[PDB]
């Protein structure tokens, strides 16, 4: 028993949402994600490549409107958000593949 590495019970993923609203907060945060494959899977290499295409942004990227990332460009051209990031968080048997952005209350919809 002592030298056997325990296998954890699998965690079920659920398409769903949680909305914590506080209009008193200056900017909104939003994160969206689908279930990832988990450490072992090779596809993670492709997912990471994919995340690189979309990439990330933040109001201090000097590249501005000429950034290669389309989402970054639009973000700049339309002042869509303060920042955004893609991610591929892995775990043993699962993971989260998504993105998170910070935007002003009135640009959330266009950003999304």
């Amino acid at each position: 028993k002592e030298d056997a590495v325990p296998i954890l019970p699998r965690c079920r993923f659920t398409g769903s949402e949680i909305r914590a609203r506080d209009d008193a907060l200056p900017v909104a945060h939003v994160a969206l994600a689908v279930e990832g494959p988990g450490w072992a899977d090779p596809d993670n290499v492709v997912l990471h490549v994919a995340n690189a295409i979309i990439g990330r942004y933040d109001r201090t990227f000097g590249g501005g409107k000429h950034l290669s990332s389309r989402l970054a460009a639009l973000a700049v051209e339309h002042k869509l958000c303060h920042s955004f990031q893609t991610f591929n968080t892995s775990y043993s048997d699962t993971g989260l593949f998504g993105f998170h952005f910070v935007a002003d209350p009135l640009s959330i919809d266009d950003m999304m």
């Binding site: 909305r19 609203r21 919809d109």
Partner: peptide
């Protein structure tokens, strides 16, 4: 523009499931 100018709302959390899970 009618979404975002409606009401001052604070401290309410809501939980919902996709229609395909229920």
């Amino acid at each position: 523009i009618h979404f975002g100018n409606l009401a001052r709302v604070r401290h309410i959390i809501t939980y919902s499931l996709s229609p395909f899970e229920q």
